[PDB]
Amino acid sequence: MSTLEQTIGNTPLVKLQRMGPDNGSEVWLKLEGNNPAGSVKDRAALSMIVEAEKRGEIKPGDVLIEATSGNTGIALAMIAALKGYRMKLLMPDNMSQERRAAMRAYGAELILVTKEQGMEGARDLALEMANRGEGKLLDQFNNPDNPYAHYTTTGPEIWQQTGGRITHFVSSMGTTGTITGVSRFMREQSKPVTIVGLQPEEGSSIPGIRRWPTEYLPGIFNASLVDEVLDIHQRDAENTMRELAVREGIFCGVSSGGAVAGALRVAAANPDAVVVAIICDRGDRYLSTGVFGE
Amino acid sequence: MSTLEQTIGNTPLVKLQRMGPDNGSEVWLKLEGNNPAGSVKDRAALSMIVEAEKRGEIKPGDVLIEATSGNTGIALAMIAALKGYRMKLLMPDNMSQERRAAMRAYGAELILVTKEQGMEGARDLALEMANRGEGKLLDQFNNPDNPYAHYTTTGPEIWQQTGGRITHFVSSMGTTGTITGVSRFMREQSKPVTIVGLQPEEGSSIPGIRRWPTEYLPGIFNASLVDEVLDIHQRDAENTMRELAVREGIFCGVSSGGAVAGALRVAAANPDAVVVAIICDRGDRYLSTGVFGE
Ligand SMILES: *Cc1c(COP(=O)(O)O)cnc(C)c1O
Ligand SMILES: *Cc1c(COP(=O)(O)O)cnc(C)c1O
Numbered sequence A, B: 001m002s003t004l005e006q007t008i009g010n011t012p013l014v015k016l017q018r019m020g021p022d023n024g025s026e027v028w029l030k031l032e033g034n035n036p037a038g039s040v041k042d043r044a045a046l047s048m049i050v051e052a053e054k055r056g057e058i059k060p061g062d063v064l065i066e067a068t069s070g071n072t073g074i075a076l077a078m079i080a081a082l083k084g085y086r087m088k089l090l091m092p093d094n095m096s097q098e099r100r101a102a103m104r105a106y107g108a109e110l111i112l113v114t115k116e117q118g119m120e121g122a123r124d125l126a127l128e129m130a131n132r133g134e135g136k137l138l139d140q141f142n143n144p145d146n147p148y149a150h151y152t153t154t155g156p157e158i159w160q161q162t163g164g165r166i167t168h169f170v171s172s173m174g175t176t177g178t179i180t181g182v183s184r185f186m187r188e189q190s191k192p193v194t195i196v197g198l199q200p201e202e203g204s205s206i207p208g209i210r211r212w213p214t215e216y217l218p219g220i221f222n223a224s225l226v227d228e229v230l231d232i233h234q235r236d237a238e239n240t241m242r243e244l245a246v247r248e249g250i251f252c253g254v255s256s257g258g259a260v261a262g263a264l265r266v267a268a269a270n271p272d273a274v275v276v277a278i279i280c281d282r283g284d285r286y287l288s289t290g291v292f293g294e
Helices: A041-054 A071-083 A097-105 A118-131 A145-161 A177-187 A234-248 A254-269 A284-289 B041-054 B071-083 B097-105 B118-131 B145-161 B177-187 B234-248 B254-269 B284-289
Strands: A013-015 A026-031 A063-067 A086-092 A109-113 A168-172 A194-200 A228-232 A274-279 B013-015 B026-031 B063-067 B086-092 B109-113 B168-172 B194-200 B228-232 B274-279
Touching: A013 A145, A026 A145, A026 A254, A041 A071, A041 A145, A063 A071, A063 A118, A071 A086, A071 A097, A071 B234, A086 A118, A097 A109, A097 A284, A097 B234, A097 B284, A109 A118, A145 A177, A168 A177, A168 A254, A177 A194, A194 A254, A228 A234, A228 A254, A234 A254, A234 B071, A234 B097, A254 A274, A284 B097, A284 B284, B013 B145, B026 B145, B026 B254, B041 B071, B041 B145, B063 B071, B063 B118, B071 B086, B071 B097, B086 B118, B097 B109, B097 B284, B109 B118, B145 B177, B168 B177, B168 B254, B177 B194, B194 B254, B228 B234, B228 B254, B234 B254, B254 B274
Parallel strands: A026 A274, A063 A086, A086 A109, A168 A194, A168 A274, A194 A228, B026 B274, B063 B086, B086 B109, B168 B194, B168 B274, B194 B228
Antiparallel strands: A013 A026, B013 B026
16 A cells, blocks of 8 residues: 555455354454465565565565465565565476466466475475575465464454454464464453364365375464364355355365365354454465366 | 445555656556455446345345456356346456356356357357346446446546546556546646546457457447557566566556556656556456566
8 A cells, every 4th residue: 555565464354154153253364365465474474585685685686486376476476576585386287277367467487396295395495595595485384474464463453353252263274474474463352262273074185275294383382372172174165166256256276165164163162252264365376277167 | 334335445555766757757556456355346346236236126035147358257246246136247358267167156156158259259149148047138238337436536536646637547448448438537627637548469369358349349339438548468468467566566567557558658748747547456357367576
């Protein structure tokens, strides 16, 4: 609103009108697709770069590097274009060509590793580049500035937007930055707020959500910040995503369908609850995957 | 913000930081991609349906019909899903399959005419359906509720957001609803505001912009509301669109590149001007057309 940076965050909070249970509960959707590049990752991407600037680490013209398997690449390509950085993105070679085009449109340089090398191989290559002087690694799974975005913006906004009436917060977990930052903020309030994390069922594939083995949970994650973990079946996430568009006019991705599937279970269980769920992204980049077909 | 309806409009106004001329002028971008379905057409689509409701014409469950060649179909599919209507969209058979999928995701029914039948044939078929009792035609090129959206929302917002400092308003013209409604509002202010319409050069194809022959200007259009018309070359619109993404982090469609190309000429001509240009949509639905390639 001065510039594009000021359009990150302060996203709408809107109520489901047709899909909730009829038990007095309310389900409110935090529309992170309203961020300029269309997903929640704009918050972490902005924060990682702004805080690095504040620490004197980077200046416009410098090279930034990240390993990405999804929306973080798009968000970082956008912030780099916005703020005047050169962005290098390492990704496994099952990233869709459409998503590669989305990142390239902002001027980012993309680098492949094989699917079998994976995200681990992508991070290792990013470290090797950083050591050669080829750029600064952001490290979204380990960088505290990811959850800090949510501690300072997402959480406070949800509290204000609900007038402190929120009883439950529901987040599909990927990096865990969202749930971790929001929980940290909510824990500071006098009122108890139940923090609900979502993961896929074993064998379910839901873009953007991870079923972390206990031993390989991200560096930024703190199990004690989460009160309950619910599992989401892939088909339930996809069906709920399709239903959101047709019944509510809310056009979002698969993990957002998962978030609402989970929030509906929380709301059904707890009469008169005020449940807030993160809608992680708009549906646009999912159409070419076929997932909006019945 | 109660529901999704309240997320239509009140879009950001952000300044160009790198691409303006250095003559004291300012170029401000009104980000209509922030509307829930990603374009400026959400405003007209909402208004046509809300005003019909106010007139007692339609009630949830009723069938609405529109002939569309672009974003209006997506916007109306979304509003129909939001408000509980059954939407039927008639389009020429050069509509991209991706855009058909975008409309279908909201539950709309799509109907083809041939490219040679065109929009005229699409409107004629819509009238024939309306006469058989198969739905209510919205008629975006003739419906006053299209420009009324911009008279009551877009214009007032731009005035407030600039603190009355706007000197020029720049709009890529399609239906002409945006320029017509905003001009009507601006003309009511004591301060003069120059209204700049953009059309493609003869032989240029810019999605969403029309080069209307004088005799076939839309029903809603009033030539006296426009102070100057500038022509935009297709390549200039496309180059400026690509430049916006790379230099500003603003990822928008071809007509938005055209709007900024035009605004830059207005700003260059008029030192210390405060120029506001409409950014009509986000870039997402353009990636598959190849236009973001250099
Ligand atoms: C990042 C992302 C998530 C998870 O959010 P985190 O803060 O990383 O836990 C969920 N869905 C999508 C589509 C995402 O991009
Ligand atoms: C509708 C539209 C326009 C034109 O706006 P009008 O209010 O119809 O004149 C420009 N570009 C795109 C992409 C559009 O969808």
